[PDB]
Structures are given as structure tokens and as C-alpha cells.
UniProtKB/Swiss-Prot annotation, chain A:
Domain of life: Bacteria
Protein name (database record): Large ribosomal subunit protein uL23
Keyword Nucleotide-binding part of the UniProt annotation: no
Consequence of changing residue 18 to Q: Strongly reduces trigger factor binding
Lineage summary: Bacteria, Pseudomonadati, Pseudomonadota, Gammaproteobacteria, Enterobacterales
Gene3D superfamilies: 3.30.70.330
Function: One of the early assembly proteins, it binds 23S rRNA; is essential for growth. One of the proteins that surround the polypeptide exit tunnel on the outside of the subunit. Acts as the docking site for trigger factor for Ffh binding to the ribosome (SRP54) and to nascent polypeptide chains.
Keywords assigned: Ribonucleoprotein, Ribosomal protein, RNA-binding, rRNA-binding
Complex and partners: Part of the 50S ribosomal subunit. Contacts protein L29 and trigger factor. Might also contact SecE and probably does contact SecG and SecY when the SecYEG translocation complex is docked with the ribosome.
Curated annotation (Swiss-Prot), chain B:
GO annotation (BP), single: cytoplasmic translation
Quaternary structure and interacting proteins, as annotated: Part of the 50S ribosomal subunit.
InterPro entries (UniProt xref): Ribosomal_bL34 (IPR000271), Ribosomal_bL34_CS (IPR020939)
Originating species: Escherichia coli (strain K12)
Record keywords: Ribonucleoprotein, Ribosomal protein
Family recorded in the similarity comment: Belongs to the bacterial ribosomal protein bL34 family.
Entries under Pfam families matching the protein: Ribosomal_L34 (PF00468)
GO MF terms, alphabetically ordered: structural constituent of ribosome
Record protein name field: Large ribosomal subunit protein bL34
Recorded name of the encoding gene: rpmH
UniProtKB/Swiss-Prot annotation, chain D:
Superkingdom of this protein's organism: Bacteria
SMART domains on file: Ribosomal_L2, Ribosomal_L2_C
One Gene Ontology CC term in the entry: DnaA-L2 complex
Organism of this sequence: Escherichia coli (strain K12)
Leader sequence residues: none
Protein name: Large ribosomal subunit protein uL2
Length: 93, 46, 37, 271
RNA sequence: AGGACCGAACCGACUAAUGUUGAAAAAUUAGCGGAUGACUUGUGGCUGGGGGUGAAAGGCCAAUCAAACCGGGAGAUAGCU
RNA sequence: GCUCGCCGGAAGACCAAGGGUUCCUGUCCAACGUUAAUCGGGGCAGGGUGAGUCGACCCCUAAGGCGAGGCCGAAAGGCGUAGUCGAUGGGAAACAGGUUAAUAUUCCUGUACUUGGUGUUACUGCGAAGGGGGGACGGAGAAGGCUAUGUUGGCCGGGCGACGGUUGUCCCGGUUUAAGCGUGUAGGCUGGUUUUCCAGGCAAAUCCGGAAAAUCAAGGCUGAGGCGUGAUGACGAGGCACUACGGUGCUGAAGCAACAAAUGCCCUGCUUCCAGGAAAAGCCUCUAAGCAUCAGGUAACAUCAAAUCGUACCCCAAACCGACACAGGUGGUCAGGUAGAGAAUACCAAGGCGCUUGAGAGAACUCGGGUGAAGGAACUAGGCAAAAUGGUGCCGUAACUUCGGGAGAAGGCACGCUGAUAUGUAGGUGAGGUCCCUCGCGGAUGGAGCUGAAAUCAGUCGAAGAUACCAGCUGGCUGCAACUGUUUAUUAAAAACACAGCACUGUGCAAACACGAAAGUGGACGUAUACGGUGUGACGCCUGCCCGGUGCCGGAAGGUUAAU
């Protein structure tokens, strides 16, 4: 088991896209941004707990932040971890 | 025309990298002079 | 925008090619000197 | 045997190769092999210390028992194998207890010949026993310097050492170089002379035969420049100096032995 | 079998033309030599300045070599311009 | 969108290094693009990189680095043991179809495979930092069996054709299907089984090795491919139905054989020759100390786990290295049709491009080419350049020679197409049918069918039959260097260097010598048939005289002479 505080600081936000929508409606999977150091074990236990669904497997990746310039000053956006969580037959949210 | 600098980050880290500089006292003088001058990218590690 | 212009001068400030004038300009000066002995 | 190759190629004109069907054609004995990496003539400092060394074919070392301290057990020679690390040839020999070794092969030694060691071993070639038990004047190779150290003298092909006199404490040996030196009595030695005396009859034939043996080109002193060698320059084939080493020491005649520790053993010097 | 023969990849550079404020701080074009060997090449390592390495030209050692580069003595000295 | 052209052993496709969002969509033309710009690898925003099986991480080590102690060194520090790190190497397993604008061995569909932990059942000896095996591996040559893959025929679907003919020996397309499981082949290796004993494998050992017998003549190991399953699944030319007119849903015939054939597999093999051809871990056994009605191990079933990191895109290039959107440089993989020996070359298939200034005029002159009267090197330092020769088979070929060569010496003949030999030859491949055994992926047979040179005779056409690209100029005298090679990257490729060969000299091993204040290392895990230095430079005939000067070697009588 994983203690509550860790399991909580792991799911950050859901990611909205038309690839997300097709993944949501056709393959029954959800893509949402997770913590930087979060693993597939802690991600799967969270979606079982806070989202009361029947999670099957977790596919993860990290998107390197794009380099953008504001005015003349150059900068690099903070890189974030992406995650595909998939479920069996049930979801309402 | 093959030029002098054909890059390879494996050779680049092993020659002037941070652990290579820390391995001897003379590189420690180099790393001191990076700090004394105050360079941002003081080493070639990244 | 043009800092490279300040740097691209600094190419033949430390040349060594003695067969060319200022490192880049090709001439016949070799022959001229060879025959001016 | 030696054979002259037909000059069907310009490089094949002057090559005489030593053939020997008695040598084994199969792979050598597995548990007596170990890694021997090439050095290139460079020491631990990385600088070239002995030049003209580099390249060549890859070689695997073979542990040859130069000590011959397995005493009293009869042994039978299995086969004769090529050794790349020596001019001579080695003999894979099987002892009576069933454990195999590599020994440096004398002349008449072939497959099926018995090998014995110790004070009870017979006086026949290939047998190893203390020098005080050797008759004076016989053909002897694989000679120890200090007792129990392992064979150090007359190792390469065609070599032998003659016993001139036995004092009882010391034994005078006429070495292959023609030097007479004293050797203490109880050093072990092997009868006969080693069996590859025609090794000096081969000729390499071309430059590649010297290159793939690990020998590099050997640029001579007068083709150098004054900053590299004492010989050099001259606007075309000028020497005008006494011939010296590249480091300035005079060669071609100058003696350089300054040991002063083994001078008590040297009865008389080579000439 | 051959440091064999003819000839592509590959390695190289013998002749000529163009180019020479070039397309290129040494190349292109038509020919040219080796092409199973002393061959060639990818990856990593080793050898450092009066030192390395050199099938030896005083060549190569980051487009720099009859003594590399960077910093310091240093505002060297200059009866010279 | 229709044509034209270029590459097609690449100017196509996939990667590694390297780059770091250039990838996709929407949006704008300030600056960048050597022009315009609606376009972009440009600016802005959003989206996109999904792994038990791919690679990294991880186990193990090579060259080497670091280096507890240790040795040595004014200091800094140098070398180095036990160890530790270090891939370019060795170690477990995933394939076919489908999907996005951008991801695919990652996602979905279908079918698989591997390694650990735990539980249960059944059996009983487990057990190393140790022993042994295995990992384990040179170059070249030669086939044989295959396969990828291509050609032809059959089958299925479609078409009677812009201008003479075309229901035909007619024209176009397709004829695809993996991993895994089982069978066990073409081959290759090894005689097998049992028993007894032993100075070895530091101790020990049933294991390795060695020595005796008995018994049988067979087993074992390895092994491509084919075969059946996987798979009455997918795909499929096309058709049907809606069309955000871009495409999107539904449905779908034949789906075979012969020939040819790899540089890919058997093959880490076989044969052969010296230059004699990594290490260690995983893996398989052996025990030691201990454990010993346990701990464990083995076989079957069940269950859990296989984390983390990269996954876009370019990668022979506008994105890497070249200051540039640069005529340059950059390692690996795939490789079809015709002609062709061929990865040459010419035209093509799939695929990608027309090179980020165009439009005219048709001066001199410059650059890259084509042709040429007559002469044919008279030009010029010099046949520089240009021109010419070019392939296969056959005939024939001199001086000289180290007997190999020279030599493709030189110099000639034939080459297309059509028919006959022979309604395609010799040959290769080879079914049906017949017979015989172990009784199969068999053996003898047998020739259907397919493929198919080479030559002769006869006729024909052109000026020309190796008609295009491609593709040796030759001979005579001679200096130098024996030769293959190497060299001043970037004005010198040579007669220069090297070279095998020869000679002299040094060196007896703790060698000589070299790098190092030293320790230590190379030499060399080599031992005078070896190693170092110098000189000459195959081979043939040879290498004459001089030791006064210099150097080196030997000598110690006498003269001189340091510190003391």
C-alpha cells in the first residue's frame, strides 16, 4: 500500500484534447497530467481510490516543455508527466 | 571537408565534465575560477 | 542582429598561411618574390 | 623441412617457409591458455620505451612449465603444437596421474615418448634432473639460474648448453653465446637440445611477413633530422659522425655491461 | 595459394580546365592509382610542449607548429619607425 | 488537376551519432528566405512522443581509468594490490492486421512467449568467494540443400477499345498471410552402455581427467528449410450505402503450380594455410563448511509482479560538422523489371524531386561541348589537351628471363535478325503411374511439364550487327628504384622513406636499452636461431689496399694527477 498524502499529491489535472475525447469515448481510457516523479503504481492506486473506477493499466510519458520567448526574453516551459489510465466497463464523471 | 569539431557528448563529458574537473586539483582551480568570475554555465555538463 | 559582424572580422587576425595575402587573398606574390632575388 | 615457393608473385619469390607435418593441426589445450594483450612497446607511462613494436596477429599465451618440479611421475607426450610466443615448439604432455602440461620440446621428442623427472629419471632427451646428476659434457637445455626458479637458459629454437666442468658446488656452463659462467649445482635442467633448429633457415619473403609478426618499420638514423637523431641532414647522404644510438650513446663497439653483481659467476666472457 | 590480374563500393590524389572578393579558408568536372591486404572503417581509450608521434617531410599535435593553445611576469626590451 | 523532365545501389526508405520541437493543425507577413509571398524548417497559440517483449537501466568483463591498505616522492603528488568503474562485446521473451492530422513490435483486434516472488500438491538430499564444462569466437576457398525475391502459366475480376486489326497463342490488375506450437528433414559433429581403480583438478567430490575390463554396434548432440496448426481469421481487386466531397460506413471472387535465384540461412559448419586466431558473467554439473524428520531443490497447477528512462521529427541532410536554407564531410540496414558477368552502365517500378530570382535579345569575349575540306605534331619546354583503342570466343604471338613471366605481346577472323538441324538442341529441374522396405519429409524407376545455352547450314537488311551507355592505344632504345606499399592534410608522390635480404656491434636476464628524482613499467610473461642500436637495401658476380688522425676495444710497466 501507499499512504494517503503521497497518493494525493500525484493526480494534478485532467488533460483535454480531441485525441483525449476519442480516447475517452472509443477505447474507454483517460489521459491526465500527473506528478513529475509519480510512478504507474501510485497513479493506479489513486484512480482506484479517488475516482472509484476499475482501473486496468497505466501508460505514462513525460512531455518536455516547449521553448517560448516572451518579448525578447527566452524561456522554457516546465516539463510535465503525461499518463494514460484505462478502465473496464464503468464511468460517470 | 571533415572539420575539427565532430561532436560526441560521451567524449565531451569525459574530457571537461564536472566529475573530470573535480577528479584533480587543477580542475578544482578551474572550477574556483568559474565561481570567482561568476559564470552561469560554469561547466560544460549541460 | 549583427553581433556576428563584429565576430566575423576576427577570423584572420591570427592567420599563418604565408602563400596568401592576409590568410585569404590569393596572389602571385610567391613568383614575384622568387624572381625578385 | 624447408620448401621454396614458386615465384608466381613478386612477393612470393624469396620466401622459404619451414613446414612440419608433425605439428598439431587442431585447437590447443583449453585450460592452459590465458590472455596476453599487445603492448605496442609502450610502458605504464604510455610513452614508447622500445620502438619498432606494434601490430601483428593476435596471440594467446600458453603456460609452459619451465619449472618441471613434478618429480618422479612418468609422463607421455600427447602431441606437438605451435607456440606463437616462442621460436621453439611446445609439447602437450600427459602425466601418469592424468594431468596435462606444456613442456618445451627437444629434438627427438614426438608423440608417444616417455618423459620422467627426478634423480630416478633416465639420461635421455626430455628428462629433467638436478645439474649435479648430469654427466659432464652432455647436451642440455632449459637451464635454471637459481634453484626452483624455472628454466631460463637455452630456451629458443636450436639452442643447447654444454657442461664443461663440475666443481660440486658450482658447474661451469659454456652457453650458446660462447660464454663460460658458473652456475650453482642444484639447478634443474633438461637433457638434449630443443627441436626447431631449422627456424633460422626461414626467410620472410616480403614486408608483410615482418609486419604481421608484430615488427614495425625501423627508419635509419641518416634519413632523420638533427632534432630527432644525432645523424641527420647534410643535403644528401652525409654522415660525418661516429655512429651512435638515438640517445647519443656510442654504438658499434662500446661495451655497456655495468652489472657488478653477477661478475663473480662469469668465468670468461664471450668473444 | 598469391603484400596476384581487370574492375564498382571504399581509400587516395597523378594530369589538365574552371574557380581563385570561389559553390568551397584546397573544391568541382573529364580522365587516374590501390581495391584480401604493410587494406579500410565505426566506438572508446592511451601517449603533451623542448614533450608526444612520425614506412622521416622538421611532417602532424583542434583551419595555428624550426617548439601548440590560454592566463600570468608584462606597461619585457626596442640606440628603430 | 493534366502533361514534360530528373534520381531510382538514390537525389528512394529506416536508424545510430549528433540536433533539441524543426513534427501536426489553426493563424500573420514586421524581420529571416540572396526576388514577389497568400508559402516556410519564419512569428503566435494549441496539440502530439503511451513498452514485461524495442533501446537504455541491470549482470559480466576487454583496452584503460580510479584505487582501501602498500611502495616511492621537497610539497602538490606518482605507481600499484584486494576491489570498483568503464561497450564498441556476451546475457529472458511479440508477432500479423487496423487506427491518428501528428504515436506504433508501445494503442486496439487476434494469437503468443519469457523471468522472478508467493501459495498448494507430489518426490527427496540441499548447500560456495572453490573445481570442471560451456560461454569461446583467425584468414581464404568450395559447393550442396534452401529461403527471401522475381518470371511464366493456371484461376478470379474487368475491357472489345479515339486511327488499319483486335473473342484472341488478346489487353489490365490481383493471386497475400507473421510470431508461436507440433512433426522432424537436407546436412554437420561424436562410437555407445555398464563396471573397477587412481601420486592430478590447492582440501573434498558421484563432476573433469587418467588407467583397466565387459558388452553392443547403436544411440546422442546440433540443424536451415518444407509441412500441419495458428488461419472456415485478417487482407483482397473491386462493388453497395452516406458523402463534413476530403473521404466515410457496409460487403467482398480467385487466392495455385512450375522455373530461376541471392552477398540472407544451414554455416560459431566443411576443406585448407600459417601470421595459430578476447575476458568474465548468465547457464550445466561437482562437492567443502554447515543444514540435516528443517533449511532447501525438483515437477504440476494457481496467483502476483516485470519498476524507471527514450519513443515526435531530420539523419548522405535546409534540421549534424562546415560563420550561410553552402556544389563539401558523415557509420549501419533494405535493394525489384529489361539488357547486362556485375552493387558497372542505360532506360524504368515503388517512392521523391524540377535544385528561392525570372522574362527577352541571339554582339564581342569567356566557360562546357558537337562537327570539319586538305595536310597530319609542322604547335609547344614537352603529343599539355584533344583525338583514337575498348567486349566475347577462336587462331597466333618475338627478344629477354629469376622459367613464374613478358603477354590481353603484337596481329587477324566471326558477332544482328529469320528458318531448319531441334513444331527449342545438349543440359538442368522434375510430377503422374509402377515396384520395394524400416514403412517416411523414404529408396529404385519413369518421363509428362517447365527452363534452356552453344554451334552448323540456309536466307535476309543496312554504309555500319561488341551498332546506344559502358568499355586497354601499341611498339622499340634507355637512366633511376628490385617489387606491393608510405610521405610534406592545403603548390613537391619521386630517384625520397620503408621493405624482405645482408653485415657489424651490444646484451647471460634483476639483461642491454628506454620512460621515470624514486617506486615501478616496457623490453618480455621473451632467454643469444632472442632482443636492441647502426649501416646497406631483392637476386647474380663481388666487395681490393691503408689503423698515420678521430672513435672504440684490450693492457698495465713507467710519467702526470683530485678530494683526503
Amino acid at each position: 500500500m501507499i499512504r494517503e498524502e503521497r497518493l494525493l499529491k500525484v493526480l494534478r489535472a485532467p488533460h483535454v484534447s480531441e485525441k483525449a475525447s476519442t480516447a475517452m469515448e472509443k477505447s474507454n481510457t483517460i489521459v491526465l497530467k500527473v506528478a513529475k516523479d509519480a510512478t504507474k503504481a501510485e497513479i493506479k492506486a489513486a484512480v482506484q481510490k479517488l475516482f472509484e473506477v476499475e482501473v486496468e493499466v497505466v501508460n505514462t510519458l513525460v512531455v518536455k516543455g516547449k521553448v517560448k520567448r516572451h518579448g525578447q526574453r527566452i524561456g522554457r516551459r516546465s516539463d510535465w508527466k503525461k499518463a494514460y489510465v484505462t478502465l473496464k466497463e464503468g464511468q460517470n464523471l | 571537408m571533415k572539420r575539427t569539431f565532430q561532436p560526441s557528448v560521451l567524449k565531451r563529458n569525459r574530457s571537461h565534465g564536472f566529475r573530470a574537473r573535480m577528479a584533480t586539483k587543477n580542475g578544482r582551480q578551474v572550477l574556483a575560477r568559474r565561481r570567482a568570475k561568476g559564470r552561469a554555465r560554469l561547466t560544460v555538463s549541460k | 542582429m549583427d553581433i556576428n559582424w563584429r565576430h566575423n572580422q576576427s577570423t584572420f587576425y591570427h592567420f599563418t598561411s604565408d602563400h596568401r595575402i592576409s590568410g585569404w587573398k590569393e596572389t602571385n606574390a610567391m613568383y614575384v618574390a622568387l624572381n625578385s632575388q | 623441412a624447408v620448401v621454396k615457393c614458386k615465384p608466381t608473385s613478386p612477393g612470393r619469390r624469396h620466401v622459404v617457409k619451414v613446414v612440419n607435418p608433425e605439428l598439431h593441426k587442431g585447437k590447443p589445450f583449453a585450460p592452459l591458455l590465458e590472455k596476453n594483450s599487445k603492448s605496442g612497446g609502450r610502458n605504464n607511462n604510455g610513452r614508447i620505451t622500445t620502438r619498432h613494436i606494434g601490430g601483428g596477429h593476435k596471440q594467446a599465451y600458453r603456460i609452459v612449465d619451465f619449472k618441471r618440479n613434478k618429480d618422479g611421475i612418468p609422463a607421455v607426450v600427447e602431441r606437438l603444437e605451435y607456440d606463437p610466443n616462442r621460436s621453439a615448439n611446445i609439447a602437450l604432455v600427459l602425466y601418469k596421474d592424468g594431468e596435462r602440461r606444456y613442456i618445451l620440446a627437444p629434438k627427438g621428442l614426438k608423440a608417444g615418448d616417455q618423459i620422467q623427472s627426478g634423480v630416478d629419471a633416465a639420461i635421455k632427451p626430455g628428462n629433467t634432473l638436478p645439474m649435479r646428476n648430469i654427466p659432464v659434457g652432455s647436451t642440455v637445455h632449459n637451464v635454471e639460474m637459481k634453484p626452483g626458479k624455472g628454466g631460463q637458459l637455452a630456451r629458443s629454437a636450436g639452442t643447447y648448453v654444454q657442461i664443461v666442468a663440475r666443481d660440486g658446488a658450482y658447474v661451469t656452463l659454456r652457453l650458446r653465446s660462447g660464454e663460460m659462467r658458473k652456475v650453482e649445482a642444484d639447478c634443474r635442467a633438461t637433457l638434449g637440445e630443443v627441436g626447431n633448429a631449422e627456424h633460422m633457415l626461414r626467410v620472410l619473403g616480403k614486408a608483410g611477413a615482418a609486419r604481421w609478426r608484430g615488427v614495425r618499420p625501423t627508419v635509419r638514423g641518416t634519413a632523420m633530422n638533427p632534432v630527432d637523431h644525432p645523424h641527420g641532414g647534410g643535403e644528401g647522404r652525409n654522415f660525418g659522425k661516429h655512429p651512435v644510438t638515438p640517445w647519443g650513446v656510442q654504438t658499434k663497439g662500446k661495451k655497456t655491461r655495468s652489472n657488478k653483481r653477477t661478475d663473480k659467476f662469469i668465468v670468461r666472457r664471450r668473444s
